[PDB]
Design a protein around this ligand. Structure first.
Ligand SMILES: CCC(=O)n1c(=O)n(CCOc2cc(Cl)ccc2Oc2cc(Cl)cc(C#N)c2)c2ccccc21
Lengths: 403, 550
């Protein structure tokens, strides 16, 4: 088959990234996987004249390879995002159910431009440096790579055309390695269609590993001020603080009346009666806070940002946004667990949501020390993709005031 | 010399070969450079060339020690600066503690390693050199390499890569043997009978030779003194090679610290806190330095530890790794890793990473982090921990801590000093407790300002301050309200800065002011601190801000 030529963005060199060290169970898993892959010509071992490197992991009963093509993608996908891009349906966010299929296997049937392949180099590392790492590079379309779905996009339309005609009301979107299938039918009916699709795909050669999302049920986390019968001076001071903050997210907030209550030098525990003006000023602000924030648009040109705060009791709040106070979405996960297992489950929940809504992953700011996260994220992780992340290590002293 | 395939090599994208002038040389050396090259020419290592090649790099001759035999040294600096980048040879050396105990172990060095491996034909032209002419009259004689030049950027990596190829089949045919690779050396170990081990070692020699790589036979090194990369490797144990050291320059200091750090692999509780403080400014290696009684006592303790010889074991997969951490002084920690109850695999220290307002639990968690990672590199799994902190103390900390944190399987070890939380702020305002409204402020020109408070029972105070920053005053105010307080106080600031410091429950800081706050916060019975926005018409705040801003 012919190879679609691929050129990095110009004035850019291929990825050169340190391979984090692995446990011996993952390494064994990886040499098993990559050995099979090589017999099947997917990859092949490589010289030392190839200096490039992209990291590799093992995530899971059987093991799965995972490659971090985040640098390569930042150096290639951006060109293919223009030249060879993939449109995102505004309707998928509205479907009742969205199932997510893995169609990574598809990519192993298109070959990659021989001139590109050196840039897909990875290194299965070795314990205690007993040996040089095993080095390979890809000859077919790699699973992590934002190029791979883009090139296969043509072939992928030809396979789904029959189904998309017998079923014109189901939405299908392709985000690197995964197929988002949204329908508006009973879970049981939707569950079949998907099974009917899986069979379609297999008829035409796409294996699909043998969950269910409900986006219409999705809703933001509104700002909620306390609703108490008697207010201590502290109770009022805090309420003043929270509003004073909301003023950024929400024009129309007022604290004159309520701050009047705090006229003097009182003790924190003293109970204060609420003046009618404040009870109204308070009553007006509550309505505004209930009002869905209005006037924030998604600007494709810009990166999304996701912040996550750890509340207690297994709960985590988040906000996604492009500019500081102009929030595209906010949410709260409560868990049914290691903090870190919780935090990776969040990151994955948020990324999925963000793929479905905007066809974009955000860049997380994770409240966890870097090395702890680098040491343990792959332990809980089940996604085929990996978002960008930085680490906040300065406490969000801001009172949670996010519920 | 090897039928091994060659690695395609290329010069940098927009660069071309070297063209350096060859300098004149004592005629005695010219004769030697001729004999050496003639022999190399006879072995195919080098081939003579004509004026068509326009590239040159310089050659030289060193006495070859006391041998008085001379040796050839080409200087490949330019060529290397123009030779493409490679996949680098691993920098990490294996740590002897991660070496699985094996009955028999053989060390096989490879003779003229590089010269035994071909060079990409199309690259040879650039590896060209000129033997200087005897008299300035006669053009010199010219050559290029057909094998990996010794000074070249690429010889190591290409040598490594070709050896890996030559081992893959053998190493597959014989899973019973474990072959390791480091530079020119191949360390093979086995659990077979001495005879079966030797038979396979010979079979290996046999194999390597068919690929043009020679190895010793019964001139292999003897085990007892495997002096390797700084270690003594005995068949039953490993240690560090003996470490010497009274001198008081700067460079003498760094060498000493480095030697001590190297000894910390295995020698428990070598200390370098003080001595590393004497590395302030530095730069002048010759600069002399005053030996503090705190650092020169340190060195006294160290010599005593270096009088006792310490050994470590090799590693046993069957058994668990254990790691146990002791708090040593302030911001200093120490740790052993072991499988049996007094037979250490290795030890080490961890010291408080740069940063103000630290805390012992946070540091402990950090140290578990460095040990966990270390473990994965050496052994490929994480250890079970033995830590001196109750699970009451940890579970409290992590549940309230703003970040995610995690520590794997661990067990309390009642060995003082125990890691504890020196205080805990109240979650809720205290009834019947004076409510101190504090503020501070300072003038960015005059480096002056005021600290103060105002209370509900009418109490007030202001003190003047000199050479202070606004933060330092925000924080000083807190200190006052504490000093002039009971056992139970409520404090109200507008300082996000000050709030943050205290809420993070620092256990110490370099900021004496913080330490005073901390030592006050201990003596207190209960403290609740609370935050209000500034200049927003809040009560005590407005009053306190007037008191000390004007
Ligand atoms: C009864 C045990 C015994 O005789 N010895 C033993 O167990 N060790 C530990 C190292 O064991 C090795 C195991 C394997 Cl699979 C491979 C090589 C090993 O040795 C190396 C490793 C390295 Cl990176 C450098 C060198 C040098 N120079 C040797 C021993 C080490 C030395 C001598 C004997 C043993």
């Amino acid at each position: 088959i012919e190879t679609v030529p691929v050129k990095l963005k110009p004035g850019m060199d291929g990825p050169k990234v340190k391979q984090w060290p692995l446990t011996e169970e993952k390494i064994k898993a990886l040499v098993e996987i990559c050995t099979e892959m090589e017999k099947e010509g997917k990859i092949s071992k490589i010289g030392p004249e190839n200096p490039y490197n992209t990291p590799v992991f093992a995530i899971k009963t059987k093991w799965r390879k995972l490659v971090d093509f985040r640098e390569l993608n930042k150096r290639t996908q951006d060109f293919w995002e223009v030249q060879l891009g993939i449109p995102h349906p505004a309707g998928l966010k509205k479907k009742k159910s969205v199932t997510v299929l893995d169609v990574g296997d598809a990519y192993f049937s298109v070959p990659l431009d021989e001139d590109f392949r050196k840039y897909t180099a990875f290194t299965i590392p070795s314990i205690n440096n007993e040996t040089p790492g095993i080095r390979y590079q890809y000859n077919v379309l790699p699973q992590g790579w934002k190029g791979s779905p883009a090139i296969f996009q043509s072939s992928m339309t030809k396979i789904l055309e029959p189904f998309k005609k017998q079923n014109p009301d189901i939405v299908i979107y392709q985000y690197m390695d995964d197929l988002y299938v949204g329908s508006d039918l009973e879970i049981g009916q939707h569950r079949t269609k998907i099974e009917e699709l899986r069979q379609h795909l297999l008829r035409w050669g796409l294996t699909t590993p043998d969950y269910e999302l409900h986006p219409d049920k999705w809703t933001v986390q509104p700002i909620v001020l306390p609703e108490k019968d008697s207010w201590t001076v502290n109770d009022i001071q805090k309420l003043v603080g929270k509003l004073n903050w909301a003023s950024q997210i929400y024009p129309g907030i007022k604290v004159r009346q309520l701050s009047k209550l705090l006229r003097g030098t009182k003790a924190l525990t003293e109970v204060i009666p609420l003046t009618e003006e404040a009870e109204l000023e308070l009553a007006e602000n509550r309505e505004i806070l209930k009002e869905p924030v209005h006037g924030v648009y998604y600007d494709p040109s810009k990166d999304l940002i996701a912040e996550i705060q750890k509340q207690g009791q297994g709960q985590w709040t988040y906000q996604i946004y492009q500019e500081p106070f102009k929030n595209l979405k906010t949410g709260k996960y409560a868990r049914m667990t290691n903090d870190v297992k919780q935090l990776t489950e969040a990151v994955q929940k948020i990324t999925t949501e963000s793929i479905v809504i905007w066809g974009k992953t955000p860049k997380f700011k994770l409240p966890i020390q870097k090395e702890t996260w680098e040491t343990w994220w792959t332990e809980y992780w089940q996604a085929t993709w990996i978002p960008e992340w930085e680490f906040v290590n300065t406490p969000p002293l801001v009172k949670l005031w996010y519920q | 010399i090897s039928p091994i395939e060659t690695v395609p090599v290329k010069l940098k994208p927009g660069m071309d070969g070297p063209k350096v002038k060859q300098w004149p040389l004592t005629e005695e050396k010219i004769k030697a450079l001729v004999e050496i090259c003639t022999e190399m020419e006879k072995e195919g290592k080098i081939s003579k060339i004509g004026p068509e090649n326009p590239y040159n790099t310089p050659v030289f001759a060193i006495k070859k020690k006391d041998s008085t035999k001379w040796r050839k040294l080409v200087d490949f600096r330019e060529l290397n600066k123009r030779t493409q980048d490679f996949w680098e040879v691993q920098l990490g050396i294996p740590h002897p503690a991660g070496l699985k105990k094996k009955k028999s172990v053989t060390v096989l060095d490879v003779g003229d390693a590089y010269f035994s491996v071909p060079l990409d034909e199309d690259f040879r032209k650039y590896t060209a050199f000129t033997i200087p002419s005897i008299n300035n009259e006669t053009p010199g004689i010219r050559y290029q390499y057909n094998v990996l030049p010794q000074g070249w950027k690429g010889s190591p990596a290409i040598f490594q890569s070709s050896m890996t190829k030559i081992l893959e089949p053998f190493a597959a045919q014989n899973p019973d043997i474990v072959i390791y690779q480091y530079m020119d050396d191949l360390y093979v170990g086995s659990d077979l009978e001495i005879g079966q081990h030797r038979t396979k070692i010979e079979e290996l020699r046999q194999h390597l030779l068919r690929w043009g790589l020679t190895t010793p036979d019964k001139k292999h090194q003897k085990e007892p003194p495997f002096l390797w990369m700084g270690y003594e490797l005995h068949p039953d144990k490993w240690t560090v090679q003996p470490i010497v050291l009274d001198s008081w320059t700067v460079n003498d200091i760094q060498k000493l610290v480095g030697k001590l750090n190297w000894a910390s692999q295995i020698y428990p509780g070598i200390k370098v806190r003080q001595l590393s403080k004497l590395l302030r400014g530095t730069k002048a290696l010759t600069e002399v330095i005053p030996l503090t009684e705190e650092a020169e006592l340190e060195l006294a303790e160290n010599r005593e530890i270096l009088k006792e010889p310490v050994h470590g074991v090799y590693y046993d997969p069957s058994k668990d790794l254990i790691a146990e951490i002791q708090k040593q002084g302030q911001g200093q920690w120490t740790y052993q890793i072991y499988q049996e109850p007094f037979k250490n695999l290795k030890t080490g220290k961890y010291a408080r990473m740069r940063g103000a307002h630290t805390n012992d639990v946070k540091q402990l968690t950090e140290a578990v982090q460095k040990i966990t990672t270390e473990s994965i590199v050496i052994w490929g799994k994480t250890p079970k921990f033995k830590l001196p902190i109750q699970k009451e103390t940890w579970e409290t900390w992590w549940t309230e801590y703003w970040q995610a944190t995690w520590i794997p399987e661990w067990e309390f070890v009642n060995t003082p000093p125990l890691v504890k939380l020196w205080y805990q702020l109240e979650k809720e305002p205290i009834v019947g407790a004076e409510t101190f409204y504090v503020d501070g402020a300072a003038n960015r020109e005059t480096k002056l300002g005021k600290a103060g408070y105002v209370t509900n029972k009418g109490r007030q105070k202001v003190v003047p301050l000199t050479n202070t920053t606004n933060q330092k005053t925000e924080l000083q105010a807190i200190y006052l309200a504490l000093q002039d307080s009971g056992l139970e106080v409520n404090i109200v600031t507008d300082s996000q800065y000050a709030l943050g410091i205290i809420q993070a429950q620092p256990d110490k800081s370099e900021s004496e002011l913080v330490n005073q706050i901390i030592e006050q916060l201990i003596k207190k019975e209960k403290v609740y601190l609370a935050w209000v926005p500034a200049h927003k018409g809040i009560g005590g705040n407005e009053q306190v801000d007037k008191l000390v801003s004007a």
